[PDB]
Structures are given as C-alpha cells and as structure tokens.
C-alpha cells in the first residue's frame, strides 16, 4: 500500500528515500508505483523543451517551464544547459581547445573534486573509433583525458552482472548477481528483470560504491533511474544537486543510458540505424559538459565515461535446440540465449542424471555451436562457479549464436539482430573506459584492463577506503595524476629449508628403478656447486616466490632448474627454469624411459613412491622440469628425481608432453628466451583459492600423494624482444595458463588428431593472469625485479587473450 495523497512540493528528486506507506518523490519512485499524486506535474516538467532560444533570453521566470533562460537561473541552479551560449555569448565546451588540468579549479566550499560516472549500456569498444565522426564531445573526452583502447567486462557479459561488478569490484560469483535471471534454491525464489523480487536486498551482496561513500561520511546521489525519466531531466537533476549547499551536496553521482543497447538488439552492432543513437548520446554528454561549464565545475569534476558490455550480430536462425540432442527434454529447465544453464525440472525426479545430459551434449554434431561443462571445469579466468545460484551444468555458446530448449520457444515469444552475454574475452563483448579531470592524466593512453579494477580507483578519487574486493589495488595507478595508492609487498609467512645430502640410497624403499650407475675431480666440485645454487641467477630471474601461508618446504637447486618442494603435498609448489633462444631439444633416452631416482636431500617419508603409480590403473606421472630441455646428457639425470615427479592422467600427459617438447622451445625462439615457472593447483571446492590438506578429494590409490585439479605455467620474457629474457633491462612481458587436470580430452572435439591440431587451442581457452595463480596457490611472484611495485601489479593482472586486433 502507498498513500499517494501526500505531495512532492519542495521534494523533487529528494535523496533520502521515505518508507511506505508514505509517498515518494525520488528518482526510483516510478519503478515501485509509489510516487505522490503531483510528481509528474512538479518534478517531470516538459514545457518549452530543453534548450534556450534568443527570444527567451531574459524572460520573466515561469515556474512551469522544463528549464529557464531568465536572469535569475544561474543562482537558482536551473538554467537550460545551453543558456550561457545562446544568451551570454559563451562557447560550447566541445568547441574549446583542450588545456591540461594540472590542479583542481573548484568553487569555494568544495571539499574534494566531485566524481560523475556517465554509464552507457551496450557501448561496444570499437564505437570509439568507428563512430568518432558523429561523437565530438566523447572524442574530446577521449583524446584530452585518459583512455584505454578497450575495457574487459565480467562473464556473463550481461547488464545486471556488469553494472553491479562496476559498483562493487567483485566477480558475479561473489556479489550474487550471476545473471539477469536467477533461481536461488535456499530462498526458493526467482529473480527477473520484470517484477518485484529483484528489489529485495537479500540478492545483492558486497558493498556498492554509494554505500561505501555514505559509511565514510561522503554523500552520494541516488545511482538508479526509472526508465521513463528522459535523459535531459537526468542531467538537469545532477546539475541541480551540484548547486545544493555544501553540507547537503553529494560528492558522487551516476548517469545511466539504455542506449546504444536498446537499438543494437533491434539493428545489430553496426546497422545503419545505429548512427542516430550515437549522435544522441554525444549530445547528452555535451549538455552535461556545458552545464558543468556554467557552474564553473568543468575543471573541478572527474568524469568517467564507461560501458557495461559490447554487442554482437545474432539472428533467430542461428539457434541450436536441445530437443535435437536430448531424449528427455521435458525433464530439464534451461536458462537460454547467449549462455545456457541447466537444472532438473523437478527435485522429486530420481531418474535425473547430469552425467547422461553432459554426454548427450558432447561433440555430437560436426559444427556444434556450444560446448557443455560442469561448472568446476569452466576456464578459471571466468571465475564463474562458487555460488549456489550458478547451475552445475553450463553451456558456453559460440559468438553469433543462441541456445534454446525447443523451436517453439523462439517463434512463440525473426525480430532481433544483436545480442551479448558470451565469453568475456570475445572482441565484440569489449566495452569502453575514459577518465577526464584534475585527478586523471592528460592525453594519455593506457593498456586494456578489467572492470573489477575500477571500484578501487573510484574509492581513490573520493578518498575512501575500499571494501574487500577482487581488484588488485595499485594496478591502475598509471591512470592517475595524484591520489595513487602505494601498497607494500605482502610479508613471507613460511621460510624455506635448504637441505644438503642427508640420506643413503638404501634407506629408500620406493619401488622405483633407474639405469644410472655410470661414473672425476674437475667436474665433481662443479656439480656440487650446482646443488648449492651456482646457476640459480640464470633460472630464478625475479627472486623466489614468497609462501603466504604456514607450511613446511625445501628449496632444491639443480644445474637446469630450482624448485620449492612441499613436505606436506609431496611435490613442488613451484619449479623455475630459463630456456634461451639457442636451447636445443632432446629425447628421453631409451635406457631412461621408466627412470625415477631417490633424492638424497629429502627423507623417504617425505617422498612419493613408484609402487603407488604401478597399482593405480587410472593414474600415471609426469615431470615439472622437462627432461627434453636438459642442458647436457649428465644434467638430464636430475630431471628424473622423485622430487620433480607429479601425478598425471594419461589423457592429460598428451597435452603436457606436447607443451614441454614443442611449445616451450617455440616460445623461446619467438620471445628471445623464456623463463618458466610451473606447478600444481588444488581447488576441489571451486572457490578460486588454494585448498588446505583436508579439502583434497582424491589421492593416488593407496597413498598420501594428492591429485592436482589443475597445472599452471607462467612464461616471462623481455618486453623489448631485442634483449634476451635473462639480460632484460626494462619492462617484462608475460603469458600464463591454468590447465584442467582431466582424465579424458572430451573438451577437445578434435583430440583424436595429432596434438598440433588441438593442444594449443585448449591452452588458449585456459589462458590466465598471474594474479589468478596467486589466489589458487598462496604464492607471491616477481618479488625481486628492478621495476616499480605498481608496474609489477599491472603485469600480474595482464591476460593474454589471443583475439586479433
Ligand atoms: C573476491 O573478493 C571477495 C571479497 O574479499 C572474496 O570473498 C570473501 O572470501 C572469504 C573466503 O571464501 C569469505 O570469508 C568467509 O566469511 C564468512 C562470513 O561471511 C558473511 O559476512 C561477510 C562480511 O560482511 C559477507 O561479505 C558474506 O557475504 C556472502 O554471503 C552472503 C549470503 O550469506 C551473500 O549475499 C554475498 O553475496 C556473499 O556470498 C559469497 O560468499 C560466500 C562465503 O561467505 C559464498 O558461500 C557464496 O557463494 C558467495 O560466493 C557473509 O554474509 C565466514 O563465516 C567464513 O569463515 C569460515 O571459515 C573459517 C576459515 O578461516 C573458519 O575458521 C570459520 O570457523 C568459518 O567456518 C564455519 O562455517 C562453515 C560454513 O558454514 C562450516 O563448515 C565450519 O565447520 C564453521 O562453522 C569466511 O571467513 C568472505 O565472506 C568473502 N566475501 C565476499 C563478499 O564474498 C573472494 O574470495 C575473492 N575471490 C578471489 C578468487 O580471490
Ligand atoms: C544492476 C545495477 N547494479 N548497480 N547499478 C547501479 C548503477 C551502477 C553504475 C556503476 F557506477 F556501477 F557503473 C552505473 C549506473 C547505475 C544505475 C543503473 C540504472 O539506473 N538502471 C540500469 C539497469 N536497468 C535496467 O536494465 C532495466 C531495464 C528495464 C526495466 S523494466 N522497466 O522492464 O522493469 C528495469 C531495469 C534499470 C536502471 N545497477
Ligand atoms: Ca547492458
Ligand atoms: Ca579452494
Ligand atoms: Cl507512481
Ligand atoms: Na598407473
Ligand atoms: Na576429444
Ligand atoms: Zn542488452
């Protein structure tokens, strides 16, 4: 119930929300059907439109008009945005030359530069260049301020997940808004775009920017706008809030536009009808900037121009139907479109089986345009599993396509020509970032970055401490003139042991053998030097990784590689080695094919054993430092130490062997040497965070040897490829991956072919940031370089995407 007989008189666009049954006058009142009876009359005036004209200049004030051109309008704060241009001989902001803003130039009483976030729905990255001739105000923001060529959204590339990620710095799995549509099985409730359940705060996790501000004494504009409030009234409302008295005035504001998304769904991303929505959004930016110029705020406010996601070509005819794969299609519920999510239609059906649904959806048609996954098997870069609202069965849909349950879902609903939602590395899903103002840099291009990083920066711009989030604070310091956040490296928690030779061969009873009994004072002192770390500067280029949790581990040195060996997990946490451009690949010799050797620095009780692998008929083994890349026949023996062995399914060894024998050398030839750090990952609860020992669900049969869920590698070289990886003076270049450790290659539909046709394609799909690996291992990389810490933080957030330009 609402008692709509109250009045909005002196309350239009009030900032404090009033509680039912009292009637509302705020920018969301329409969306709840709760505005007072006179809200349209008083708060949504339209008389005489949005622009002054010559005849109106100097007019006697008429309170009915939408905006004013009377002499008193500047002091009331309610002039039309073009007033000074039409009536006082001023220029539009867009016609003024850009001039560096070295310091804030703010009116008296302003405690800090305000922040205005100008957000645009469906604004694809390439619009900034392709539309530049029809967007002069936006082009001036971009060219004069700080811009990225694009900004990466979060998966799924939908509106509700992305806007809430911008507001919170969190992945959707953590903030809870995992799609525009959701079922929560604990609540037994459904969230939808239409309807009232979406207003309940139980859906919305984390802490959004407006709340962070309010809790720390920084006042905020209300961010959400009811759809029927025209854009011109949204801008006038912001400008009026900026004329409030000092103690009442917000410091942070948001504008939102439904365009160009609305038209892009109808016409496609580059349909000829798309020019006009782009012109109109530019004209709105012009109104805002002219308005700021009138208030003497155009060299005081920080403005962010930012989008939620892009837009791809998609038509009804490019739809895959589950009714062409499943016998049982009426027993499932599908969340459809540019991603699929599947669950049982009834919880009382004990004949529902996820394994049979997955198998019926796997590599069944030659050009199949989606791929099924259990959520824990999705690329770790998507960070899309740790939430009860994400269904166990997921379909990753190819760009340009849809999935649906049955054909009648598609014509009892062609209309549309664009859509979005796909994998967040897809080029057409990329969106926009520009920052303009005293706190941003002047005429500066920055590299692409992820939208999860912006919350921290917005907090920096306002002097706020961020709530705990998924950004890496400091990684965007290169965007800012001042207000940078200067973090310190985390402290190492566990220090390593440095064991010497402590065990005789006969103390081991591991069931392993090796043909190594083959026998010199020159070379003996030399090999002793290698075991004490004489080559470590060659193979450990950026310091040892720091261990950020409590554990017991040993540093082990060798001619060709260095490792950090866990006494708890019975294997390395990390293994580090450098391969020059000139390095040679060799075979595993015939006599050494099944060789495994006890390590006389490590006790039998803290070693793996070969008998466990013999008896586990599903499990084999591989090596972290590859025997193929040994520096000499004599050094190759080190690669068969028991302390370099890890458990590997035979199907996974196909992938791993090809990476180590072929691809490492290819990268060294292409990048002028590479440093490689490889290791295991254990994430059985799919939370993106290092598992403790008591979370491990699978062991090599009959043993305490834990089975990794994934294997990583971090591959680093010199950004200036004229210098070799091991003699680099300047910035670094990195690519990394997190490969799923699976007992089949069912993910790769062409796996019966030679590895040259499918392995690298798999690895590209499972591309990763160094930061992703840090979360999954409790390790901290790049501790000893010549580079500034903020530069290293940027490096750790880089993702190699393998998309063309
Ligand atoms: C990205 O950034 C985020 C933010 O930093 C990272 O997320 C944090 O990770 C922590 C570890 O997973 C986690 O810490 C836990 O918090 C528990 C209390 O949480 C409540 O309070 C906080 C603070 O206000 C709040 O944010 C939480 O919000 C979650 O839950 C509500 C609904 O309840 C949602 O609306 C909201 O969206 C959010 O959901 C997300 O997180 C939860 C987990 O909290 C998931 O289950 C959801 O799927 C979703 O992803 C809560 O309101 C606290 O109780 C935990 O402590 C347990 O573990 C410790 C180990 O040290 C143990 O000592 C304790 O005893 C305790 O165990 C007991 O409970 C167990 C479970 O019942 C039981 O089995 C035991 O036997 C014990 O009884 C823990 O400290 C922190 O909450 C989140 N924060 C957020 C916002 O998500 C995220 O990891 C980053 N991602 C990456 C990849 O880096
Ligand atoms: C979601 C979300 N999370 N946080 N925010 C705030 C936020 C955060 C940021 C930011 F600063 F973070 F960038 C910038 C801007 C905002 C305000 C967003 C806003 O005003 N809404 C946009 C999304 N909307 C819709 O898509 C929509 C369409 C149609 C119907 S209907 N008429 O069919 O019912 C309802 C809803 C409604 C308006 N929005
Ligand atoms: Ca959107
Ligand atoms: Ca985990
Ligand atoms: Cl109403
Ligand atoms: Na075996
Ligand atoms: Na296959
Ligand atoms: Zn859309």
Short mmCIF file of N, CA and C and ligand atoms in Angstrom, two decimals, residues 29-30 33-35, ligand 5:
data_model
loop_
_atom_site.label_atom_id
_atom_site.label_comp_id
_atom_site.label_asym_id
_atom_site.label_seq_id
_atom_site.Cartn_x
_atom_site.Cartn_y
_atom_site.Cartn_z
N UNK A 29 10.93 6.31 -7.65
CA UNK A 29 9.54 6.15 -7.20
C UNK A 29 8.64 5.48 -8.26
N UNK A 30 8.84 5.79 -9.55
CA UNK A 30 8.02 5.20 -10.66
C UNK A 30 8.16 3.68 -10.75
N UNK A 33 5.88 2.05 -8.38
CA UNK A 33 4.49 2.60 -8.35
C UNK A 33 4.14 3.28 -7.01
N UNK A 34 5.01 4.19 -6.57
CA UNK A 34 4.88 4.84 -5.27
C UNK A 34 5.01 6.38 -5.27
N UNK A 35 5.11 7.02 -6.43
CA UNK A 35 5.26 8.48 -6.45
C UNK A 35 3.98 9.15 -5.91
CL1 LIG B 5 3.65 6.31 -9.45
#
